[model samples]
Target chain A: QNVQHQLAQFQQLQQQAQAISVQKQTVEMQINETQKALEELSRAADDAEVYKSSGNILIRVAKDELTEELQEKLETLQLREKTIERQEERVMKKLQEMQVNIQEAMK
Target chain B: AALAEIVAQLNIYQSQVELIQQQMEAVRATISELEILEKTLSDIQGKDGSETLVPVGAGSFIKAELKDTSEVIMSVGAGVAIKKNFEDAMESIKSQKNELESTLQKMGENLRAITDIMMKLSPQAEELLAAVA
Candidate 1:
């Protein structure tokens, strides 16, 4: 009876899924970048020069402190990615069920 | 839509494995390079002032006397270079190589975990799609 109506609902679900997927991709990228930065820091000498960019200038920083900060960032990004992944999974399952219903109803 | 989402998830898993493999390669390459550096450092010790060929780019080496083999300049990331004692440099490289080895092993574990997920989900998704058709 409301096949076309449910089609509209399905479109909304697709849109939400796509948005969450994009968010997941972004967080994953952040996690990768943070990991690389940490790896570089790890390879550096304990007394190696560390610098953080502030606008147009590089400010010298302590190696231990810089590494600690990056480790925190990586942890936060990983947590965010996991949350997004869960949301995406929920939406995906819903979208699948909705699509099957629409298809069967049409038949 | 359900099948489409499953396909997308699988592709994401596929790319995740690819990225992990790439990281593993990089880790391995760095470890090997550090190993080579360690060997060269060790070989040059106790041979100070001995004439040796120093490679100056290209496949050519210029004969020169070793200058103060006790200290060496090493890059410590972020465009920073510092002078360290021979023993200190060796220690640095060995530690770096050790860390990379651990990173490589962890990547392998992650790769296996993702591969397992992909293997399990792939057939299930395919069968569903086929049955629906």
Candidate 2:
């Protein structure tokens, strides 16, 4: 009986270990996804800066004889750049929170 | 009557043995879970050198990995007494919380570092874009 009980306990432990393994895998997946989102946002922010600078340069070039249409396009692009910047900031914040959540869940 | 008494005593011992065995099983299971958790915690604690724990976002920039190895190690140690029913599982969980807190603190530091780096780089990147435009 003692031996049987010991075996049962061992089996139970093995099962628990398996369950934990699954949970660990899930947390890892989430971490990976969050990290990916963060990187993308950083790159997007950089790209937005590029667009903003390009628009500024165009405006400078057309400064004396700027056409209304050209000015409007530049303004639209600048606005888009700002939007991207805001989105990037949001993504960064989300990444930070995700990292915290993942760490906590793993614990 | 003596035979009956002996059988009853045997049954009691069997039940006690079963109880102890179940408790031991629980301990072993908890230990397994704790080991995985310990490794994860250690990974966070060891986040000083490697990008292995880098946070994943869209483009793959490396984010800091947070780790609190001390709290996790302590919790795992406390879990040892659980098999003997000397300690409550909640106590182990409380220690785990300490580990999480430390990890979160490290994460906060990483966030700050990232923000600082971005702030410094943004202007430079903007300058390059200006020159190009």
Candidate 3:
């Protein structure tokens, strides 16, 4: 593709990359905060029956299930983040390569 | 031709640099959050059975009890409450932090690369303008 056309393509991809970045911030923030809550619960005695906030009522959770649930959340979130990160990186590489090509053409 | 060409290329390079910067900031924010959580985890351990104010939302508190350090009970999706052991939870968190921070570092390195090229290209563009004029 011509440099001008390629740059136009690059601009469109830029918007998508930016959108992902925003999404990444939102999801990661939730994951981190949720993690904090889990940590707070973990501080209690091993036998302590932890309570989780379920909408209106703080529902009492099972005695030994917090770790699994948290892990699951993390796993799901990690998968999502990784997918976005990969796409972001790919776009990023394309930008760099595009710039390099443009520089060569300018020569 | 050289001056206009380099100048046109400069704007695109600058635009990409800005995008890389935005991406970098996103990763940095994630890293910072993970680091803070990691610190909190290290601190809050072994406080089992301690009476504390747990916020249930709407600026409310439950005055709930922390059973023990052995495990924490958290809510699963759909109002399901699940329990997890402390050490195991720690492992998962540590792994998450490691992965996130490592990715963050890689992004930083990449940004540096892009910035280096940007810096090199800028002065040349400026000089090309001078040479052509």
Candidate 4:
């Protein structure tokens, strides 16, 4: 009976160790993936900034010409930029969430 | 009688360990789900391609792939040029802005759902660890 009890204790310890190991590995993987994702997002944001500057230049040129047709086109492009800006904002939010998740997993 | 008490304590500890194991499983699953969701969201944002090139200001030139401009002729005739007004531009812009807003709102909703799932799982995970310790 004493031998049986000892065997049970050994099995319990092994199971607990195995479970903890698996959980640790999974959490680590998540943290790495989130970090990579945030890097990609940062690159995308840089690109968006470029587009925004170009749009602003076009609008300024249209203002100088005072042509109705050019003004109309510039306005359209400006609107497109607004849409892109909103998307950029959303991406930023996602980046924050990923960072938080990584931090939490590490904890 | 001492052996019986020892057995009872052992049983309680075993049950506690089991609960902790279950909580750990829950945390693992939630973390996996959040990782996948974050990756997918990032991919979508990156692929949208609205941000790839820097906008050159008017008259400041950057090298780009030249498409045939021969199809674009400036008509010098005195005929009335249909003036493109800003109204249509404004309407289009409004519509596009609304679409982006809607998409982001949906993404936010998904994030909220995942966050709630994680929040519910986290305390349980802590409880399990405490029990194990």
Candidate 5:
């Protein structure tokens, strides 16, 4: 492959890595934000039930159910962030390799 | 060796891209968080449902009883998550929203600047390398 092609790809990889970094941080933030929101729900109207979207229809769920749902969602978001972290490492590693290659090519 | 300075500048650009990414993540996260906060506010205000089945865990439901729909409690940070009136809650949420918005506007501006420079740098680095090769 052309050195410039490698360079271009390296740039792209860095861009992708950056995107994942952005995404992961956002996910983490979402987790915290939900936590606060749910915390309010826990306190507000104690032992209250709320409507939750379940596919096509809205289902009635109790307070505990909502907390459970929110907890599960937070877990999912955490998992996504972990996946992105791995992906980010891989992208950066490849970019590093390409950086080395292009430097050699330039030489 | 002639491309040394350009390569170095490219490195700086790369670092800045990373910085911009962090900034972007911060802003995006705040934006999402604020929206969720707004939702919580709405949910607290809209307390029409008296009694319903709230899911407990892993797709389980339990019945809950709500006595007063008018009164809502809120956590104002720390371990002080206690009962708060609607008026106070709105004020607190508004400042948070305002601060986030302020940071986000600055962050947005910085992000665009960094991205434009990053784009230009990559191609310029390519052009220089291609010319050198």
Candidate 6:
């Protein structure tokens, strides 16, 4: 392929890379929130009132139950985050290889 | 020139599909979460002035008098809580669930549309690449 054509391909790949980056950020935010909730849940005393967001309402729930749920959610989010990281790495690798090829062809 | 453009657009669509699928997954999760909340809320219906185990914290519940179970305090955003009856609260939850499920359905249609286009063009792109290589 011509150098200009290769450069166009690079642009498209970059867009996909950007999408993956957005996904990574979202997962990171969810993980952070889940961790924060777990921390706050732990800090409360055994007799303190605890409520969790359920749709548009706050419902009373046991702290330990909420803790277990948040931990499971964190696990799933972390796994998702790892997958996104691997995808980003693969995309970056391809972009780098394509860049080198384009540079050589241009010269 | 045109062949390269086709390959580039195809790659973009593939990425688009991936992004949309992730969004759909998130929406589906939200819908299910809301459904569970609805189920939990439903269990409290028609049990006014009864004895119940209301959790204080840390996996323990204290004996409580469930006075006026017909009334519920709903969080209406911005740290505001509004008092509403059980039926009204459920209506609100149902609408929210409906909106999310609708969004998920639309995403699936859009995903299928893009995949259809990709299916049509992929073979041609492959053949072009084969010819050039």
Q: Which model scores highest in TM-score?
A: 1
State residue B62's C-alpha deviation in candidate 1, in Å.
1.6
Off by over 4 Å in 4: A1-107, B1-84
lDDT string for model 2 (B16-119, tens) is 55565555566556555655554444333333332232325564534332333233323245445323121344456557666655555565565455444444
Give the per-residue lDDT digits (tens) of candidate 3, residues A1-107.
66655665677678887998998898898789778867876787768766644333343555456666777777788788888888889988887887787777667
Best by lDDT: 6
Whole-structure CA lDDT of model 2: 0.44
TM-score versus the correct structure, for each prediction: 0.51, 0.24, 0.45, 0.26, 0.47, 0.49
RMSD (CA, Å), each prediction:
17.6, 30.3, 15.3, 20.8, 12.0, 11.2
For TM-score, candidate 3 versus 5, the one ahead is 5
* DockQ of each model vs. true complex: 0.01, 0.02, 0.03, 0.07, 0.08, 0.05
Better by DockQ, candidate 6 or 4: 4
Write the candidate numbers in order of decreasing lDDT.
6, 1, 5, 3, 2, 4
True contacts kept of 1: 0.00
CA lDDT of each prediction against the hidden true structure: 0.79, 0.44, 0.69, 0.43, 0.72, 0.82
Candidate maximizing DockQ: 5
How far is B36's C-alpha from truth in model 6 (Å)? 1.4
Interface RMSD of each: 18.9, 21.1, 10.0, 11.5, 6.8, 6.9
For candidate 1, list the clashing residue pairs, or say none: none
Better of 2 and 5 by DockQ: 5
Model 4 residue pairs with clashes: A54-B55
Q: Is the docking of candidate 5 incorrect, acceptable, medium or high quality?
A: incorrect
Instruction: Please give the lDDT score at residue A14 for candidate 3.
Output: 82
Candidate 1 vs candidate 5: the lDDT winner is 1
lDDT of 6 by residue, B6-103 (tens): 98899899999999989998998888877887766674566555445655678665665556777778889999999998899889999998999888
lDDT per residue for candidate 4 within A1-107, as digits (tens), equals: 24333443445555555655555565455445545444444455332322212222211111222234334554555565555556556555655655555555555
Per-residue CA lDDT of model 4 for B45-81, tens digit only, reads: 3232222232466656443421221111222259743
- Model 3 regions more than 4 Å off: A1-107, B56-62, B73-83
DockQ preference between candidates 3 and 6, better one: 6
Report the candidate with higher TM-score, 1 versus 2.
Answer: 1
